[PDB]
Amino acid sequence: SHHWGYGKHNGPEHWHKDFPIAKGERQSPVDIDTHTAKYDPSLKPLSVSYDQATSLRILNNGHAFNVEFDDSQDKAVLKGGPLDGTYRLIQFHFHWGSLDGQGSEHTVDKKKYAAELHLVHWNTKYGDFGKAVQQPDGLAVLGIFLKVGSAKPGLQKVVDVLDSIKTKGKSADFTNFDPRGLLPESLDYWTYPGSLTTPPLLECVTWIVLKEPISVSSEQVLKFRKLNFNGEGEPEELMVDNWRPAQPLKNRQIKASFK
Amino acid sequence: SHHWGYGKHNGPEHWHKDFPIAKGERQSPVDIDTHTAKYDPSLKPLSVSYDQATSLRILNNGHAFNVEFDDSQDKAVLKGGPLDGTYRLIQFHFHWGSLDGQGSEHTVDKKKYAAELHLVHWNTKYGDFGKAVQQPDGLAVLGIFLKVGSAKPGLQKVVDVLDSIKTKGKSADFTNFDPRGLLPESLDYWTYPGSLTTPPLLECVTWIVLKEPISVSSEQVLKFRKLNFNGEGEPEELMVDNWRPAQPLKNRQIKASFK
Ligand SMILES: [Zn+2]
Ligand SMILES: [Zn+2]
């Protein structure tokens, strides 16, 4: 009965009908205006501890594809930065475009990237993800821009398995993936309080959005575009433009860890 | 696997473990201290429109039994009183004791009744119940005390079907029930902002609690106590004392429609 998507009739412009928080005061994504996003010197260094990250599976959920991690222990955690205590990595996914010029959720001085990576973490204060998503400080999503340029070696293992999860509901074993291979060199970041960028759009996310994009090749991102929103047997609907546009900032302050 | 109940180990004293809102600022039930619950002359008469009410079924959910109504239209609505706009009746149920001296959720100057009836309504503003339960003004529950006295004729149709829904999961067709037959003659009420009295304890409820109890016979309430929490084939666990005790009022005001 309930569906949502990125199409003409079920798209971001309509999500409010089932999810009234879509018009809330803390919605993501947003545009980062660098002229207004002020350097905050009290922001601490971001601590990314992914050395023991344990990936398990990869799956097409009908909106994006997710790589899932074992979050039963502190094997892959985000700490410091703007955060209070310890946030475990549960999954990552991407949003991308039908063309190289668009695909990202966050924009920077109105500039769109080809795609955006989201590493999703939950506050261990709340015992599990389910309890976390319902708290204002429940999640931390580390957001990373993807520009088209040189191939990203650390992304190839993802790209290579995509032909096995073409359609909604498909999944595959996906062990030993190294998420450090998707990070840029600089951990300089912007931060602001926001939300999930898909329904149910819960306002439980501390956003950390990195200054430095990673590069991916034209052919790498092109592989993302050969996925399907639809299930097996249904009409083909290519999985492209699965991004929500910039939402009004309202009275939120985007703080910068760098000058 | 998540469970809750009224037992030693899964009871109201433990609900906070899975539902941290249990310790929130707007939890129900409460004690109504009549010395402090002040008459508010600006409170309007309560408007109960149940003339077209359409009951459908009755069911044992493993925590109480519910009589469900067709809420697809304005056939049975609560309006006026402390409420803004129109609230449709979805179901009623009761909480009761193992003895005649206890069973109610709300108390009045610490006085417990043998049971408490809850007519559950949702704000039509939000399209359905599912969306309603997540809003601060989503629900209105009309609460009515039951004291042991004379038989309530309008309750007998409920009592007579209970042998057919003994155990969790059991349901039966239940048409043409008249919910007006469960009302006392006075619609004088106390009101306060609160919550669901069972998990998930959401703080979405405008409580309207009637001053005048209805009477039920000793044998009528005794029939409620022959129901089972458990499913068919499971150990017998009599459905008694399915009430949450009074929670701290915090900085809430209980207003009275009467002097
Ligand atoms: Zn995302
Ligand atoms: Zn109830």
Q: What is the resolution of this structure in A?
A: 2.0
Residues B30-43, buried b or exposed e (16+ Cβ, 10 A)? bbbeeeebeebeeb
One-letter identity of residue B108: V
Q: How many CB pairs under 8 A join A and B?
A: 7
Ligand 2 mean position, distance from CA B4 (Å): 15
The CATH number of whichever domain residue A250 belongs to comes to 3.10.200.10
Spatial separation of the C-alpha atoms in residues A213 and B88, rounded to whole Å:
52
Spatial separation of the C-alpha atoms in residues A187 and A108, rounded to whole Å:
17
Residue B116, phi then psi, degrees to nearest 5 = -145, 130
Ligand 1 mean position, distance from CA A102 (Å): 15
**Does residue A18 belong to the interface with chain B, where contact is any CB pair within 8 Å?**
yes
Helices marked H in chain B: 129-132, 156-161, 218-224
A175 is in an annotated binding site: no
Question: Residue A20: its chain B contacts at CB < 8 A?
Answer: 126, 131, 135
State CA A74 to chain mean position distance: 20
Ligand 1 mean position, distance from CA B180 (Å): 50
Spatial separation of the C-alpha atoms in residues B80 and B48, rounded to whole Å:
9
Kindly list the distances between the CA atom of residue A57 and the CA atoms of A11, A121, A123, A184, B209, in Å, as whole numbers in the listed order: 28, 17, 22, 24, 52
- Candidates A18, A20, A131; nearest CB to B20: A131
Question: How would DSSP label each residue in chain A?
Answer: -----SSTTTSTTTGGGT-GGGGSSS-S--EE-TTTS-B-TTPPPEEEE-TT--EEEEEE-SS-EEEEE--SSSSSEEEETT-SS-EEEEEEEEEE-SSTT---SSEETTBPPSEEEEEEEEEGGGSSHHHHTTSTTSEEEEEEEEEESS--GGGHHHHHHGGGS-SBT-EEE--S--GGGG--S---EEEEEE--SSTT--S-EEEEEESSPEEE-HHHHHHHTT-BSSBTTSPP-B-----PPPPP--S---EES--
Exactly one of A3, A16, A63, A121 is catalytic; name it: A63
Preceding omega of B235 cis (within 30 degrees of 0): no
**Does residue B126 belong to the interface with chain A, where contact is any CB pair within 8 Å?**
yes
Residue in A with minimal Cα distance to B19: A131
Measured between its terminal Cα atoms, the distance across chain A in Å is 49
- Tell me the sheet residues that pair with B157: none
Give the structural domain span for B41. Answer: 3-259
One-letter identity of residue B98: S
Q: Which of A21, A128, A129, A131 would you mutate first to test chain B, the one with the most B CBs within 10 A?
A: A131
Instruction: Domain count for chain A, please give it.
Output: 1
Q: Indicate if A63 belongs to the active site.
A: yes
Give the CA count within 13 Å in the CB-facing half-sphere of A98. 8
Spatial separation of the C-alpha atoms in residues A240 and A42, rounded to whole Å:
39
**Does residue A136 belong to the interface with chain B, where contact is any CB pair within 8 Å?**
no
CA-wise closest residue to B181 among B150, B218, B156, B210: B156
Residues B126, A18: C-beta atoms closer than 8 Å? no
Q: Which ligand is nearest to the CA of B95?
A: 2
Annotation: binding site of B: 93, 95, 118, 197-198
Q: How was this structure determined?
A: X-ray
Which residues, in sequence order, are CB contacts of A243 under 8 Å at separation 6+?
Answer: A6, A29, A95, A96, A97, A102, A103, A104, A105, A116, A197
**Does residue B129 belong to the interface with chain A, where contact is any CB pair within 8 Å?**
no
**Does residue B20 belong to the interface with chain A, where contact is any CB pair within 8 Å?**
yes
Phi-psi label, residue A140: left if phi above 0, alpha if psi -120 to 50, beta otherwise = beta
**Does residue A169 belong to the interface with chain B, where contact is any CB pair within 8 Å?**
no
Element holding B170 (H helix, E strand): none
